[PDB]
Amino acid sequence: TSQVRQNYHQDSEAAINRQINLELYASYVYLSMSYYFDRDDVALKNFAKYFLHQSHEEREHAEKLMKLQNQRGGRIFLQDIQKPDEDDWESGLNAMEAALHLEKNVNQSLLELHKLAHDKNDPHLADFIETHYLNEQVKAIKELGDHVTNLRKMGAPESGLAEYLFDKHTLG
Amino acid sequence: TSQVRQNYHQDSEAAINRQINLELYASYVYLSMSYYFDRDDVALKNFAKYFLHQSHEEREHAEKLMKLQNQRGGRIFLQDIQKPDEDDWESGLNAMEAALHLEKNVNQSLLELHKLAHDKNDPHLADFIETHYLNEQVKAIKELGDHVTNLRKMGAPESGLAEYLFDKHTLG
Amino acid sequence: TSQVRQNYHQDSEAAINRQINLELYASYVYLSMSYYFDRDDVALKNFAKYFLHQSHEEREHAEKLMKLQNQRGGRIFLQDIQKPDEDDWESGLNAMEAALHLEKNVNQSLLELHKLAHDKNDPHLADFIETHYLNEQVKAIKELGDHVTNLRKMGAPESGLAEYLFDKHTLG
Amino acid sequence: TSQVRQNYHQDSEAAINRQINLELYASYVYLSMSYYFDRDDVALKNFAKYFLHQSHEEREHAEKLMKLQNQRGGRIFLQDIQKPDEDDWESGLNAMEAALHLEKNVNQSLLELHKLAHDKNDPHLADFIETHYLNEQVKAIKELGDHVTNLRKMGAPESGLAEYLFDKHTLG
Amino acid sequence: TSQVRQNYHQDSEAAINRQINLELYASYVYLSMSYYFDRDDVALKNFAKYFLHQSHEEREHAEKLMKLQNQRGGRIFLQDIQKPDEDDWESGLNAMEAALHLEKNVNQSLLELHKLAHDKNDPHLADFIETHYLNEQVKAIKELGDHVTNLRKMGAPESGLAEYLFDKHTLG
Amino acid sequence: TSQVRQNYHQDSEAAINRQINLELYASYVYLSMSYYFDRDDVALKNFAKYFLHQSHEEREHAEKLMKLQNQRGGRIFLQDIQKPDEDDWESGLNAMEAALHLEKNVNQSLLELHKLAHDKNDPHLADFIETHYLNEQVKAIKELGDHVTNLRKMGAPESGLAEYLFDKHTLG
Ligand SMILES: [Ca+2]
Ligand SMILES: [Ca+2]
Ligand SMILES: [Ca+2]
Ligand SMILES: [Ca+2]
Ligand SMILES: [Ca+2]
Ligand SMILES: [Ca+2]
Ligand SMILES: [Ca+2]
Ligand SMILES: [Ca+2]
Ligand code: NI
Ligand code: NI
Ligand code: NI
Ligand code: NI
Ligand code: NI
Ligand code: NI
Ligand code: NI
Ligand code: NI
Ligand code: NI
Ligand code: NI
Ligand code: NI
Ligand code: NI
Ligand code: NI
Ligand code: NI
Ligand code: NI
Ligand code: NI
Ligand code: NI
Ligand code: NI
Ligand code: NI
Ligand code: NI
């Protein structure tokens, strides 16, 4: 038992390791999306920059959870980072839709983590999730929804013009 | 065939995808090491900072190879990022030794990549490797060797004093 | 024999004179394209500026090879600069496609020059080509491919709107 | 007929295309001279810089005439740029004499262009030539004459000392 | 075997020790030349400064190769630095000619070192030589050739005036 | 006889040439020591920096004596610079002891040079030695003695910790 450990359930510790993996996974999905838009036959530079920024953010999310694990005296166990479910993300609209789906999955995982913390009467963990993760997820989901809506209304993905102009005026 | 592709062998393209994976793997190993030294029962903050810096560097290495793949008209295929071979890195000396071994493995992979590029008469790829990777590897290996030597001479890993003082005066 | 000449094969010297001519030729093609977009019945000012910049760059490429010839003790022999294969470049998309083709031809010439240097065991010439020409060509080809892709996806050349908006938001 | 064309005779348009070619030719002659003085067995760096500056100026002359052609609604037709009449320019004095001869030939062409413009009652073209070309030519010819005179009086080309000192104190 | 050593042939290691000695030797030759021009019966202060600068440069060349040896895990073995082949360098022209000969000898040694590295499939060593030594040698040889040419054309070594004026206007 | 020579005995001139050689030799010993501490299996960076600084100082000592030789109208005759008596300097303490021995040998040579100058009634040479060399030697010897004392008291060379900490806190 860690000399610092206090009111930290083993289920919470395991859940934090799973969330670390999920955040690293999200980082990897976004990296893949980013360089898809860097392809010479896609060539939407601001889509690429947008998803690269997201990738680096998700890495920060993971590192803060690793720090949390050690803060509470839990022990980090890393697992493989699975490659994303696609190699070719099709279009700006499709990538944005996939990112929305991803962020809602991460959000669901965090809400389950919060539920667990509360069930185990761990207010420090509950508030850590509340303070550093829940509103970030709500903001990310809202932003992605906004982007999907505009791309759809503009005529994406069929209109290459639409994705070009969205890349310039929204993501640029 | 990509409209940009020229003098880029399919073996080179495959080799670049493998090197991307190896760089991401190195990034993950270093992340694991970093947070090992953040444990309350290890608590060497400058070892932790050193390996975290290395982790972020390796991520830059991977991203530059992904950019290269698209520059030459190859196609990125990501694979799982395997978890590191240890969860507990034992000591500062042991971690440094493991990092040395890792950098020499990455170096061997890059020398084979250069050999392939030269065999396929790809001077752009050969010089990309020469210019951006080979001396970086030699410098990294020399630095890690220096660190291992000093930690050994100081009495690590048995002397917790040695690793403490090395953390303060070399890594800090 | 020049007092400075050393390890410089006569075939390399001849090849450098041919590359000088090819760089001056590229400069001239780009000059022609530039002023095509300055026509009152074409009137895409940022296409014009883009190709004029390219023209001046190619002139720098030629001058650096002339300097190289004298550095190694070879002797410059200039040849006519052939007029470009078109007087009317049709459209922004068509010009970009022609520029892509041109840069790949120049690249092929440089890869053959590097192959020759290596065959004649001239590492100074090989590395001169590697360092100052090969990645510049890869970058130019990637950029032109990106531009072609976007113009195609936007609806060029049929959509005069597409080329107008690309001129404003990408080239401007 | 161009929508902008007004009071612009087809003979004037053709004459402007010929003058464009002559300006590009002058640029090429000066480029050749410049790198002749960069040879290790000539090695007069300020002669080289002087003629390189002249080369870039002549390119500006050509570009302004191309702009003029489009301003008036004429159509640019480029022709080959002939290689200069010498590969070896012999000496600083000889190069200066050849440049003087060249500038007087260009001047003669411009005076004929002005005569044509006036014959066709084209005061815009006449004044364009007057304002941007005629005094530039007179100044260039006077400067070259001054240089030839001094080099002759100093003992060039036989005195290598003379050309060395002129390179340092006049061209430097 | 050094813990850092990788893909570093014993022949390469020996060749690097020989090149270290040759660079120190060049430094010594230039030191000797420098103070020859400091003699009261020679008294060309800018020749003296020129060769002293060269001496210190060659020392930097040697130190970078010593660093390289340790970077690759080779072991430095120094040898005597032979005194130069002359005590009296005769004249500015003669010294410049001797320096040209010296730089071409050093260049030949470096080209053989590069050939060896390539034969032993050592791209890190090949590119180290390419990047830090080959163009430096080409530039040095061209500069010395230029100086020899001007001194000859001016009338050196018979004209003490020529060497005086060259010292003032080129080396000063 | 030099036009500047006055009250300068041939024995003094010869002695100055010997001292030039001894100063260059000291520079070389210190260069060797410096890069010994740059080895991956020694890796004391501040020992390396300390002896490199000493090497460059000794080179300044030699150059000032060469200047002196020409000031007095003597003639410089250089001799080989002998390689140092060791390739492997064992330890920080051992190197410091060897440097102390070296500086006392150089000092003995300078005291004999001063004795000679005084015997030949050469007060300019005597005071040159007094002013620029004797106290520098006393200071160097005292510093090296201080370093040896501290390294011994700390437990060097057996304590790798001692040399590490001395490198950090005294030489750094
Ligand atoms: Ca998998
Ligand atoms: Ca696995
Ligand atoms: Ca033709
Ligand atoms: Ca290279
Ligand atoms: Ca012709
Ligand atoms: Ca000898
Ligand atoms: Ca010896
Ligand atoms: Ca005194
Ligand atoms: Ni996010
Ligand atoms: Ni996240
Ligand atoms: Ni779903
Ligand atoms: Ni690294
Ligand atoms: Ni890496
Ligand atoms: Ni192993
Ligand atoms: Ni280009
Ligand atoms: Ni080019
Ligand atoms: Ni074709
Ligand atoms: Ni080869
Ligand atoms: Ni002119
Ligand atoms: Ni002109
Ligand atoms: Ni004539
Ligand atoms: Ni040099
Ligand atoms: Ni050198
Ligand atoms: Ni010879
Ligand atoms: Ni000293
Ligand atoms: Ni000394
Ligand atoms: Ni003794
Ligand atoms: Ni006395």
Curated annotation (Swiss-Prot), chains A, B, C, D, E, F:
Report quaternary structure and partners: Oligomer of 24 subunits. There are two types of subunits: L (light) chain and H (heavy) chain. The major chain can be light or heavy, depending on the species and tissue type. In the human liver, the heavy chain is predominant. The functional molecule forms a roughly spherical shell with a diameter of 12 nm and contains a central cavity into which the insoluble mineral iron core is deposited. Interacts with NCOA4; NCOA4 promotes targeting of the iron-binding ferritin complex to autolysosomes following starvation or iron depletion.
| Localization per Swiss-Prot or TrEMBL | Cytoplasm; Lysosome; Cytoplasmic vesicle, Autophagosome
Q: What does this protein do?
A: Stores iron in a soluble, non-toxic, readily available form. Important for iron homeostasis. Has ferroxidase activity. Iron is taken up in the ferrous form and deposited as ferric hydroxides after oxidation. Also plays a role in delivery of iron to cells. Mediates iron uptake in capsule cells of the developing kidney. Delivery to lysosomes is mediated by the cargo receptor NCOA4 for autophagic degradation and release of iron.
State how changing E103A affects the protein, per the record. No effect on iron binding but the oxidation rate is severely reduced
A cellular component term from Gene Ontology for this protein is: tertiary granule lumen
Annotated residues that bind Fe cation 1 are located at: E23, E58, H61
> Top EC class per UniProt?
oxidoreductase
Q: Which GO terms describe its biological process?
A: immune response; intracellular iron ion homeostasis; iron ion transport; negative regulation of cell population proliferation; negative regulation of ferroptosis; negative regulation of fibroblast proliferation
Domain Ferritin-like diiron per the UniProt entry, residue ranges: 6-155
User: Which of UniProt's keywords are assigned here?
Assistant: Acetylation, Cytoplasm, Cytoplasmic vesicle, Iron, Iron storage, Lysosome, Metal-binding, Neurodegeneration, Oxidoreductase, Phosphoprotein
The record, for PROSITE patterns, names: FERRITIN_1, FERRITIN_2, FERRITIN_LIKE
What organism is recorded for this protein?
Homo sapiens (Human)
Alphabetized InterPro entries for the sequence: Ferritin, Ferritin-like, Ferritin-like_diiron, Ferritin-like_SF, Ferritin_CS, Ferritin_DPS_dom
Gene Ontology MF term list: ferric iron binding; ferrous iron binding; ferroxidase activity; identical protein binding; iron ion binding; iron ion sequestering activity
Give a yes or no for keyword Iron in this entry.
yes
Tell me which residues are marked as the site Essential for association with cargo receptor NCOA4. R18
* Chemical reaction(s) catalysed: 4 Fe(2+) + O2 + 4 H(+) = 4 Fe(3+) + 2 H2O
Major localisation: cytoplasm
Question: What Pfam families does its record include?
Answer: Ferritin (PF00210)
Q: What is this protein called?
A: Ferritin heavy chain
Q: Which SUPFAM superfamilies match?
A: Ferritin-like
User: Does the UniProt entry include the keyword Cytoplasm?
Assistant: yes
Known tissue expression:
Expressed in the liver.
